[PDB]
Amino acid sequence: QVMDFLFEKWKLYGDQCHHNLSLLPPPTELVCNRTFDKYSCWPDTPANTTANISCPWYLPWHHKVQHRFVFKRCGPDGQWVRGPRGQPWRDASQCQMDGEEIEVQKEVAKMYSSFQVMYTVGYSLSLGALLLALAILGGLSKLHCTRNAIHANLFASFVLKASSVLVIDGLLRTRYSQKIGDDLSVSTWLSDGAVAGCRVAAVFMQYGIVANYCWLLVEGLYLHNLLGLATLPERSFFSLYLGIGWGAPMLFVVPWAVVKCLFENVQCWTSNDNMGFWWILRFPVFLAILINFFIFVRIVQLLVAKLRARQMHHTDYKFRLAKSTLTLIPLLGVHEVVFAFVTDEHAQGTLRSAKLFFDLFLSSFQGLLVAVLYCFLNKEVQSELRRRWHRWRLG
């Protein structure tokens, strides 16, 4: 909101002085006349007067940069200094920002650029494989299986997300990396421009994040509900699952869209203020993480029972197996780790950055890991691919 909240003060201050230049003229040639210094108007300081005048309030954060002044001198019959190429230069450096932060800025940025590069590779890398997985899954003998259709639809939720977040930053990158120097450019870009495209890509991106978590939740629920019952499921309840996924995120993303469009509008809605209005897009996430972590520990609680029941000829050889499955099953929930406790609130310092890095990395490579583990290492698809290649490599 800083951008728009400084456009106003450019105008506000640039008019108070116009009324301070009004009712003010006095000496014109003996002492410098009433002049206007573009960004900053002040009553014209006379020839070599004391520089007790502070630099303008202007910049909103002036409450911590108050006790420093500006030096202006009316030299040649009341004239200011010209510079390298004759441009009027003013040594207002003492009123400027504090290098310190500027440094820290340089810093965070770099780190954020590395995270961006490192998560863009991740999405893109797993965006390729997801597609290759969907194409191989939805065109073969197993094109319609109750367990397999959920996996295919999850790979779609992953493609949707990856694509969503790879395009929301495109806009962002492109809507800040334009040359905003010429008066026109800056003045217009910070104002209503293609904020339409941005806004709708934001809603469309948040939908995707929440849909991904909901399809991970329904993936867990299908497996949990497939183990309690003794018989096979008479009804696939597939309709129900396509509504717990795809549909339910809407019941959480639409109230967000409206709360932004109506109560808190900002350039592009990516910027998240009012943490209460982000809890409406986080509560489904926390629910779909906790209530799937519960069934994750429940599944292992019986997977350990089945591995110790029979086949005890390989005493203590279950160790490797139990682990291999336990690191193949988290295709649903891991976030728990640096989630929960650490929220967006109460997370500052290097902890926040470590959380962001860890979560981003896992969320960017999740899709690739899931696709590899469920469409390239499955023995069923490997044997089938072999068959369909054998049958082509016949005559």
């Binding site: 800083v2 951008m3 400084l6 450019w10 573009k38 960004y39 910049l59 441009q87 207002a92 920002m97 800025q105 965070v108 940025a109 954020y112 995270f115 961006q116 998560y119 977040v165 929301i168 930053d169 962002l172 800040y176 905003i180 120097g181 008066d183 800056v186 910070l190 948040q206 994040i209 929440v210 350039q267 592009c268 990516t270 910027s271 998240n272 982000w278 897009l281 986080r282 996430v285 976030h335 989630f339 967006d344 959380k355 962001l356 979560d359 981003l360 969320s363």
Partner: peptide, 29 residues
């Protein structure tokens, strides 16, 4: 929703960076 936090933070970044950048043009031109 980690990715959301990141993009929120980066949005604050490109904005504040553009604020100073804007002010710098104003200071000069």
């Amino acid at each position: 929703h980690x990715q959301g936090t990141f993009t929120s933070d980066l949005s604050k970044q490109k904005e504040s960076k553009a604020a100073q950048d804007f002010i710098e043009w104003l200071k000069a031109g």
